[PDB]
Enzyme design. Structure first.
Site: not given
Ligand code: HEA
Ligand code: HEA
Ligand SMILES: [Cu+2]
Ligand SMILES: CCCCCCCCCCCCCCCC(=O)OC[C@H](COP(=O)(O)OCCN)OC(=O)CCCCCCCCCCCCCCC
Ligand SMILES: CCCCCCCCCCCCCCCC(=O)OC[C@H](COP(=O)(O)OCCN)OC(=O)CCCCCCCCCCCCCCC
Ligand SMILES: CCCCCCCCCCCCCCCC(=O)OC[C@H](COP(=O)(O)OCCN)OC(=O)CCCCCCCCCCCCCCC
Ligand SMILES: CCCCCCCCCCCCCCCC(=O)OC[C@H](COP(=O)(O)OCCN)OC(=O)CCCCCCCCCCCCCCC
Ligand SMILES: CCCCCCCCCCCCCCCC(=O)OC[C@H](COP(=O)(O)OCCN)OC(=O)CCCCCCCCCCCCCCC
Ligand SMILES: CCCCCCCCCCCCCCCC(=O)OC[C@H](COP(=O)(O)OCCN)OC(=O)CCCCCCCCCCCCCCC
Ligand SMILES: [Ca+2]
Ligand SMILES: [Mg+2]
Ligand SMILES: [Zn+2]
Lengths: 121, 47, 113, 269, 102, 534, 59
Positions: F62, F92, F127, F157-158, F241, F243, F245, F256, F290-291, F316, F319, F438
């Site tokens: 998943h 192209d 993952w 690919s990426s 991280h 990734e 972003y 936008s 931070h992870h 952010t 933005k 988790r």
């Molecule tokens: C792309 C990022 C992404 C998205 C969108 C989701 C969406 C969902 N995820 Fe997940 N998830 C992860 C990335 C994501 N997840 C990652 C990285 C982990 C970590 C595994 C780990 O920690 O080991 C995780 C783990 C994770 C957990 C934590 C389980 C655990 O570790 O104990 C759960 C719990 O319910 C969960 C369930 C779901 C559910 C119910 C949705 C629902 O939101 C599903 C509903 C979403 C849709 C219906 C999307 C629409 C479908 C499309 C096909 C898009 C169509 C649009 C176009 C094609 C333009 N996934």
């Molecule tokens: C969509 C991708 C995405 C984005 C954009 C972010 C954005 C951010 N993430 Fe996250 N993060 C993940 C995807 C993402 N993350 C994933 C997949 C994990 C789990 C990985 C794993 O466990 O395997 C994770 C887990 C993760 C961790 C690790 C925690 C842990 O594993 O124990 C941390 C720690 O710092 C973090 C923090 C943040 C912060 C500070 C931002 C910031 O960039 C957010 C910025 C946005 C705002 C701040 C809000 C908008 C701003 C305002 C409204 C202005 C006012 C705000 C202030 C004055 C503060 N997130």
């Molecule tokens: Cu991060």
């Protein structure tokens, strides 16, 4: 008969006229010798002074009312023209499609762009 | 190179001129996409 | 067949950029020849004595290490020293050959298992 | 020229590539490579000839791709100034990607050396591992790489100036110089004291120097195909991207080997 | 640079006087009303003149309808449409609310 | 038709193929998510009979499917290869055979991922593929090797698409376009291409070190041998991280555009948006640890990394406030891309604020590997990528398909995925802050209530997906009919409040981007003469 | 041997795909196609034994 090698830009007619003669026996090829095709056309242009593949930005000197529209050339029957104002960057980008039959009006600055086709497809 | 263009020439599949219905292929694609993890669960639970 | 077909609209082919292009071609050829002769001077006066003066010491140390590996060839199995914990670990057998042998595995030097 | 005659050409410099099967062919070869090696690592295939065949198909598909691109650049003449600028920048970005892979390997080395583990013995290199001496063989390696850089820039400027026999002899000499580097590297791997399984020192050492060895084998192939294309008059005086690509690859590999030499030997010992 | 209010007034007077067909009258009026200010009644008077000159009624009703949706109170709309009473009587355009009585 | 799709070398056919593979794999990832949430409805083994290995395998399937095979192919591949040559006026994209090999190397990554799931035990490592759990002593068999090869093929690919995107938007712009006069989606995919190019090397390095430990007896990560497992955490999160972003920044591009075209006013400070996206892209690579606040980093190291992670809240925020400034004072035409933009704004701000609470290394004591972090990341990933994807689809699909979609069904689909995604991802913060760990297939039975309400929400989200793939069918068979009746929205921008209808009909598309003046489905090679710009 | 002009004439004057335009094209292209078909048929064929558990016999 046979085709020539198009020594300058007024002499080329077709893609087969862009071939040119090879390097002789032990020299390196020059650009004039062995370039062919579109790169050879570009090379003859850079030698003459004429930049082929025009890269001129849009004429934003005047406004272009509907009695003297801004004429833009096209080797097709339309063109995409992005207007931004009477100076260069006056308002935001506004993309228009002048065609043969329709002039293009900007609606933000009100410029009128008239296509003239070169064509002969 | 010059391909055909228009409303349905942009896509790989064939929608209009068709012997079977389009709904057959269009929902079979997403159905096998949805049923790939059930094949995975069946194999792992049989093991 | 349109009347716009035989209209020349490329502009004037008498800008000074044409002559500057051809003169820059001549200048790049002459400067390339001068830089080429400078690099035969460097590659003859520098590279060849460096490679000879390094190859003589490298041959002497290569013959010395060949002699030391030839002495280390006649060493019994009980006399090879204690392989440490981190040395030649075998997490799983290799899939080439028969097992415990790497790619550039020298049995004269690397004897441990 | 006229307007009728200007109507028959591209009107934009960039290359409109014909359809070609080599993307999906290289992709299928890469899938069969990954599958066959994951099945031959764990004994599901008996022997390695399947992985050998998959590597062979990947190589011939890549060679046919390069045959098509030298055909389009030489005989079809589709590489004008904009396409040449584009492929130059594209090779530069791929070179940056390889440099960053080597930065990852240097991170692995610097972590495992600046934090010496207690099972190793809190010293770098570990106890029982006699390191490769810097001055004996890798000094010869690094000076023939520096002379390879001098030889490619001499041969490139001899190509620009028009002299054929100087540029051909320069490219031949530098190709034999880097295969002398490849042979000395194989000799160093043959008569070395430790293995790749001999802890983290052997691990990151053979990882970094073997990846650089692989890139120098790739540069051997690129210098060979550039010698062939200069011999059979493919390279002009002002139009050559294979050569500029191969010499910036040569210099980047030289800088990577300089950092590899100084760190892995003059700081590793 | 930011324009003062009278500079805005002079510019849109000149623009509405130079407008020559219906696309230009509607364009000038669109980016006349898309600022953060209700235009001065001289500008609306020039807008009604310029919509008359291109012989199009309903944009001259849209002047007052956009003025209603643009102005902030219900009393400043009255102050505008009684200060344009003689102009609207001379051209003879209605308001939209006395055109569709509901 | 063998040539046009198999031997493809123009960007739009590659783009619709990227989108098809993306949505196929996204359906599969949603099914795995449904099965995960179904097993996590009530305590005790409900559906998978014991077998926590299969639950972990579906967790990595998943995760890796939704990240590397839905959002990254869809956002990067399909939308980049359709609009990035179009929105700059390029004919192209340069290196189109690299553009074709990136797509065609993706679905075999899908093939070997599926066969990793099918072979002897399956990859049950998370993952993140942390050793020594993913090593050969804990995971025997060829499964994690095939998951590693899936990651390697999608890394190829990426990276190759990133190279293609960089030289396309640098070298092949149209004649009037300076780099400052670019759109925000083109700038967004440019910055994303740079982060891909500078991130995927470290991922390839760490993954190949994992493979070398697994099959070639070497010790990068084996403690019996001197290796250190924290090196993999450093390498994988220096990828990781950047990734995430990479996944969010094309959403910042799409939002936008849909916000500026459905508020009928341009973006507030567009050059500041370029600077903010580039600042986020530069600031990603400095915050990667931070992870791993838990592994025992020094106090000065964590005190650095919490400040570095907190600094990205400022761009952010710039933005997210400039989007509010674009929507303020405009004339909102609430079509479904505008609905997805507004919902993206609110729910991504909520996910970012939970991320800011996660940025502190003293609080990530209390929140690491809880369901609070899955609340944070499913909020930013789910909303900021799926709502961006749905906004991009409902925004550009009438133009790039010529077939309008049913609008009432689009708004019920939006609303259903809105409340369903909220119902699933809001109690995860409660489960996390009360200490639910988790990646568990079973829990203490004090977590059952919020697990029940989230498992109720999953069925709402899957119903909205089934509805969406019905909207696809209804768009593909009745698109021209949808144009001719009143079942859709023909004009994305209404007339202004002075503009006559015939004056509108002579000028029916008013955009600041090229793509909307192109014909429905556009020419197979458009831009014969290059698109001029002042 | 300076076949560049002659190969320019052959390559531009040809209604064949670009990998077929050289006179020596079949000499590469037929064994490559056969070897490619074998090399992508066989590791797909070894997947049922992989998911079944039957490792290769050491004979
Ligand atoms: C792309 C990022 C992404 C998205 C969108 C989701 C969406 C969902 N995820 Fe997940 N998830 C992860 C990335 C994501 N997840 C990652 C990285 C982990 C970590 C595994 C780990 O920690 O080991 C995780 C783990 C994770 C957990 C934590 C389980 C655990 O570790 O104990 C759960 C719990 O319910 C969960 C369930 C779901 C559910 C119910 C949705 C629902 O939101 C599903 C509903 C979403 C849709 C219906 C999307 C629409 C479908 C499309 C096909 C898009 C169509 C649009 C176009 C094609 C333009 N996934
Ligand atoms: C969509 C991708 C995405 C984005 C954009 C972010 C954005 C951010 N993430 Fe996250 N993060 C993940 C995807 C993402 N993350 C994933 C997949 C994990 C789990 C990985 C794993 O466990 O395997 C994770 C887990 C993760 C961790 C690790 C925690 C842990 O594993 O124990 C941390 C720690 O710092 C973090 C923090 C943040 C912060 C500070 C931002 C910031 O960039 C957010 C910025 C946005 C705002 C701040 C809000 C908008 C701003 C305002 C409204 C202005 C006012 C705000 C202030 C004055 C503060 N997130
Ligand atoms: Cu991060
Ligand atoms: C699956 C059942 C097929 C039955 C066929 C029976 C044949 C009898 C004759 C019937 C008529 C001919 C049928 C063949 C034609 C055909 O259907 O296309 C065949 C293909 C695959 O074919 P295959 O190789 O699996 O077929 C084996 C035999 N050759 O299907 C599909 O891509 C289904 C695709 C689903 C639709 C996806 C919808 C989403 C698209 C989004 C695009 C927009 C992107 C916008 C953003 C960029
Ligand atoms: C995708 C891109 C991935 C980029 C990151 C790659 C990092 C790892 C580089 C591996 C180099 C290994 C090496 O060169 O190994 C050199 C060793 C040398 O043997 P020895 O000196 O121990 O002999 C003892 C006496 N001296 O051969 C071996 O023992 C076998 C090594 C494993 C088998 C080969 C693995 C090949 C993988 C290459 C992947 C390339 C991509
Ligand atoms: C694996 C084996 C790698 C072997 C590489 C051989 C490259 C030769 C291709 C060539 O020679 O391409 C020739 C073209 C241009 O030729 P030109 O304009 O100079 O022709 C002159 C006509 N008068 O160069 C390029 O487009 C750029 C080359 C980039 C090559 C990168 C290779 C990366 C491989 C990944 C592994
Ligand atoms: C590892 C990936 C290596 C990428 C090198 C790209 C070089 C820059 C470039 O763009 O090289 C240009 C060519 C593509 O050119 P094209 O024919 O699409 O361009 C048409 C206009 N000239 O690259 C390649 O042939 C890459 C070949 C890949 C071989 C298989 C690699 C599998 C691993
Ligand atoms: C910390 C406060 C800010 C937080 C972030 C902002 C909120 C996000 C949403 C913003 C939406 C509106 C943006 C578009 C508006 C616009 O673009 O307006 C453009 C106008 C143009 O003015 P001009 O023509 O005179 O100049 C033309 C040349 N510049 O400038 C303004 O209006 C000025 C507004 C000033 C705001 C001051 C705020 C004072 C309160 C601060 C907090 C106090 C808290 C007290 C608690 C008890
Ligand atoms: C927003 C709309 C959709 C939200 C779904 C909520 C799921 C209900 C639930 O989670 O139901 C769990 C609870 C408690 O039931 P229990 O603890 O006895 O469960 C033991 C096994 N059944 O049932 C209810 O209280 C139903 C009433 C909930 C009212 C929700 C109204 C929201 C507005
Ligand atoms: Ca359970
Ligand atoms: Mg953890
Ligand atoms: Zn304008």
């Amino acid at each position: 008969p046979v085709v020539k090698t198009a020594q300058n830009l007024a002499e080329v007619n077709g893609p087969e006229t862009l071939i040119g003669p090879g390097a002789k026996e032990g020299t390196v090829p020059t650009d004039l010798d062995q370039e062919t095709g579109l790169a050879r056309l570009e090379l003859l242009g850079k030698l003459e002074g004429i930049d082929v593949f025009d890269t001129k930005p849009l004429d934003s000197s005047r406004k272009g009312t509907m009695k003297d529209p801004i004429i833009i050339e096209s080797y097709d029957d339309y063109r995409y023209v992005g207007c931004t104002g009477s100076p260069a960057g006056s308002h935001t980008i506004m993309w228009l499609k002048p065609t043969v039959n329709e002039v293009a009006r900007c609606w933000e600055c009100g410029s009128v762009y008239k296509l003239n086709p070169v064509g002969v497809p | 190179v010059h391909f055909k263009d228009g409303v349905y020439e942009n896509i790989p599949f064939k929608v209009k001129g068709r012997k079977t219905p389009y709904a057959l292929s269009h929902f079979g694609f997403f159905a096998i996409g949805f049923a790939v993890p059930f094949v995975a669960c069946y194999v792992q639970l049989k093991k | 067949l349109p009347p716009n077909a035989l209209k020349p609209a490329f502009g004037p082919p008498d800008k000074v950029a044409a002559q500057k292009f051809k003169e820059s071609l001549m200048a790049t050829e002459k400067h390339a020849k001068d830089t080429s002769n400078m690099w035969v001077k460097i590659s003859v006066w520098v590279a060849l004595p460096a490679i000879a003066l390094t190859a003589v010491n490298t041959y002497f140390v290569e013959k010395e290490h060949a002699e030391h590996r030839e002495h280390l060839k006649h060493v019994p199995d009980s006399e090879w020293p204690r392989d440490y914990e981190f040395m030649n670990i075998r997490s799983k057998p290799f899939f080439w050959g028969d097992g415990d042998k790497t790619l550039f595995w020298n049995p004269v030097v690397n004897r441990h298992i | 020229m006229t307007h009728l005659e200007r109507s028959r050409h591209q009107q934009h410099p960039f290359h409109m590539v014909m359809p070609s099967p080599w993307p999906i062919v290289v992709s299928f070869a890469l899938l069969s490579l990954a599958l066959s090696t994951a099945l031959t690592m764990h004994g599901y295939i008996g022997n390695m000839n399947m992985v050998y065949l998959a590597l062979f198909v990947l190589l011939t598909s890549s060679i046919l791709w390069f045959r098509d691109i030298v055909a389009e650049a030489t005989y079809l003449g589709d590489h004008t100034m904009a396409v040449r600028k584009g492929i130059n920048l594209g090779f530069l970005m791929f070179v940056l990607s390889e440099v960053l892979i080597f930065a990852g390997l240097f991170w692995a080395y610097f972590h495992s050396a600046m934090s010496p583990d207690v099972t190793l013995g809190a010293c770098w290199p570990p106890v029982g591992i006699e390191a490769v001496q810097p001055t004996e063989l890798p000094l010869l390696n690094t000076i023939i790489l520096l002379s390879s850089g001098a030889t490619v820039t001499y041969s490139h400027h001899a190509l620009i100036a028009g002299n054929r026999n100087k540029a051909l002899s320069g490219l031949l000499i530098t190709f034999w110089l880097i295969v002398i580097f490849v042979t000395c590297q194989y000799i160093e791997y043959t008569n070395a004291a430790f293995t790749i399984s001999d802890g983290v020192y052997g691990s990151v050492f053979y990882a970094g120097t073997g990846l650089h060895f692989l890139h120098m084998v790739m540069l051997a192939a690129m210098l060979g195909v550039n010698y062939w294309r200069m011999r059979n008059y493919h390279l002009t005086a002002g139009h050559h991207v294979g050569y500029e690509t191969t010499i910036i690859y040569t210099h980047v590999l030289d800088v990577i080997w300089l950092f590899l030499y100084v760190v892995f030997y003059w700081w590793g010992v | 640079d930011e324009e003062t209010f009278e500079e805005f007034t002079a510019r849109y007077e000149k623009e509405f006087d130079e407008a020559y067909d219906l696309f230009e009258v509607q364009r000038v009026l669109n980016n006349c009303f898309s600022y953060d200010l209700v235009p001065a009644p001289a500008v609306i008077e020039k807008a009604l003149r310029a919509a008359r000159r291109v012989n199009d009624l309903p944009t001259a009703i849209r002047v007052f309808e956009a003025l209603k949706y643009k102005v902030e109170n219900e009393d400043q709309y009255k102050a505008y449409l009684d200060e344009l009473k003689d102009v609207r009587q001379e051209l003879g355009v209605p308001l939209k609310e006395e055109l569709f009585p509901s | 038709m063998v040539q046009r799709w198999l031997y493809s070398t123009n960007a739009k056919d590659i783009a619709v193929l990227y989108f098809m593979l993306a949505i196929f794999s996204g359906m599969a990832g949603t099914a795995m998510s449904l099965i995960i949430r179904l097993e996590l409805a009530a305590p005790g083994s409900q559906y998978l009979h014991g077998n926590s290995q299969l639950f972990n395998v579906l967790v990595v399937g998943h995760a890796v499917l939704m990240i590397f095979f839905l959002v990254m192919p869809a956002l990067i591949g399909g939308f980049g290869n359709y609009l990035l040559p179009l929105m700059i006026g390029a004919t192209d994209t340069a290196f189109p055979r690299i553009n074709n090999i990136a797509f065609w190397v993706l679905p075999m990554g899908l093939v070997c991922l599926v066969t990793s799931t099918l072979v002897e035990s399956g990859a049950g490592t998370g993952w993140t593929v942390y050793p020594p759990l993913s090593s050969i002593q804990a995971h025997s068999g060829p499964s994690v090797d095939l998951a590693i090869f899936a990651l390697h093929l999608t890394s190829i690919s990426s990276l190759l698409g990133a190279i293609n995107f960089i030289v396309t938007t640098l070298n092949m712009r149209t004649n009037g376009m300076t780099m400052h006069k670019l759109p925000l989606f083109v700038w967004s995919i440019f910055i994303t291409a740079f982060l891909l190019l500078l991130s995927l090397p470290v991922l390839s390095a760490g993954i190949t070190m994992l493979l070398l430990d697994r099959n070639f007896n070497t010790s990068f990560f084996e403690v019996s041998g001197g290796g250190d497992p924290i090196l993999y955490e450093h390498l994988f999160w220096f990828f990781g991280h950047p990734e995430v972003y990479i996944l969010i920044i094309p959403g910042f591009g799409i939002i936008s555009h849909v916000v500026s075209t459905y508020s009928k006013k341009p973006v507030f400070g567009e050059i500041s948006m370029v600077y903010a996206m580039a600042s986020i892209g530069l600031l990603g690579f400095l915050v990667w640890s931070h992870h791993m606040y838990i592994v025992g980093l020094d106090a000065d190291t964590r005190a650095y990394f919490t400040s570095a992670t907190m600094i990205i809240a400022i761009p952010t925020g710039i933005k997210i406030f400039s989007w509010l400034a674009t929507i303020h004072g405009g004339s909102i035409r609430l079509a479904t891309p505008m609905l997805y933009a507004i919902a993206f704004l609110f729910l991504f701000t909520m996910g970012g604020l939970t991320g800011v609470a996660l940025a502190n290394a003293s609080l990530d004591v209390a929140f690491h590997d809880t369901y609070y972090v899955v609340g944070h990341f499913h909020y930013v990933l789910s909303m900021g990528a799926i709502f961006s994807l749905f906004a991009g689809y409902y925004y550009w699909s009438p133009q790039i398909l010529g077939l309008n979609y049913n609008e009432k069904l689009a708004q019920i689909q939006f609303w259903l995925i809105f409340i369903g995604a909220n119902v699933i991802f809001f109690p995860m913060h409660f489960l996390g802050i009360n200490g639910m760990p988790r990646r568990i297939p079973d829990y203490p039975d004090a977590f059952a209530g919020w697990n029940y309400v989230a498992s109720i929400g999953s069925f709402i989200a899957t119903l909205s997906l089934f509805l969406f793939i019905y909207i696809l069918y209804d768009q593909l068979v009745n698109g021209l009919n949808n144009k001719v009746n009143n079942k859709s929205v023909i004009y994305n921008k209404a007339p202004d409040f002075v503009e006559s209808n015939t004056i509108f009909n002579l000028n029916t598309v008013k955009s600041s981007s090229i793509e909307f003046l192109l014909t429905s489905p556009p020419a197979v090679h458009s831009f014969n003469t290059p698109a001029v710009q002042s | 041997a300076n076949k560049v002009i002659q190969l320019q004439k052959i390559f531009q004057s040809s209604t064949k795909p670009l990998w077929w335009r050289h006179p020596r094209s079949a000499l590469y292209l037929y064994p490559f196609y056969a070897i490619f078909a074998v090399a992508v048929v066989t590791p797909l064929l070894y997947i049922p034994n992989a998911i079944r558990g039957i490792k290769a016999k050491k004979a």
